[PDB]
């Protein structure tokens, strides 16, 4: 009796406690579009206008969001909303409606379910970096 999946990306994470209640949406724990970096405000507005209010009229979600890096915590928020919504629809109503809505959301873009595998590689041998080498004298 534990249906929770949260959302993690790169180094950041966001636990999304989803449960039935009055059915109102609370995001970021702060006003909708006031975020201080201001870099990626418009990107957050895709689902709330693409889906509608009736779709999310019964969802009570509470998010613990942590992580430094816009590419990390942002896009983690979208992976989290998509995954939590998909799990909730799969569990509570049916699977065909889940296929339709999840197909719509993950057909908007692909990067939702895939995180970047690139990571800093080890500093290598006899050189300042992983590939550069100390200047060779003749």
């Amino acid at each position: 009796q534990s249906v929770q999946v949260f959302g993690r990306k790169k180094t950041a994470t966001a636990v999304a406690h989803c449960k039935r209640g009055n059915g109102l949406i609370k995001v970021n724990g702060r006003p909708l579009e006031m975020i201080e970096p201001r870099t990626l405000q418009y990107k957050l507005l895709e689902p709330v206008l693409l889906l509608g209010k009736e779709r999310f009229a019964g969802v009570d979600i509470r998010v613990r969001v942590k992580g430094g890096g816009h590419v990390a915590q942002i896009y983690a928020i979208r992976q989290s909303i998509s995954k939590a919504l998909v799990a909730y629809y799969q569990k509570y109503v049916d699977e065909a409606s889940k296929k339709e809505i999840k197909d719509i959301l993950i057909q908007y873009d692909r990067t939702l379910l895939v995180a970047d595998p690139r990571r800093c590689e080890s500093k290598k041998f006899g050189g300042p970096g992983a590939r550069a080498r100390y200047q060779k004298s003749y």
Partner: protein
Amino acid sequence: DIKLFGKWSTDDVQINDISLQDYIAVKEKYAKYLPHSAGRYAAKRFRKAQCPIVERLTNSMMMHGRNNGKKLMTVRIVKHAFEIIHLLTGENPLQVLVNAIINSGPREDSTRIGRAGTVRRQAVDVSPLRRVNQAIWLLCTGAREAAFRNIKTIAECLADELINAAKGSSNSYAIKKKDELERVAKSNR
């Protein structure tokens, strides 16, 4: 309600031909409400070509060692003055949008010859994508030199970027340099 962005729509912009979508291709998941899709464009060849034209134009301007790849710059620039000009225009930028660059474009470049000799270059062409994007890169250099040591700055040339973007007539500057080199190389055809 499948309208692209918040002000355009894909239900009416048709060419009734399925072969001229080499420049604007909005029919599938690749469509972006904001070009900040992250990712890499150097992991393997043809993946820089598989960049959307918009994102290539907005990113490729990253040069020098201080603004190198910082995507925040590209996204802030493409948001700023875009938010302004959309409401302040009222009309369609489509005319200039299309009719400066996306057929300013050249139609050939030049390549090396034989085993020696750097006094002339044999004329070849490319499938228009690589030629158009080399012209776009030189136009990024030109927009720099129109900002670098000049008056008109970066993040205020959104008209010129839309010009560089859209579709099909000729008014450019770096591209007419490219066309002069076109003719020079074509003098061997």
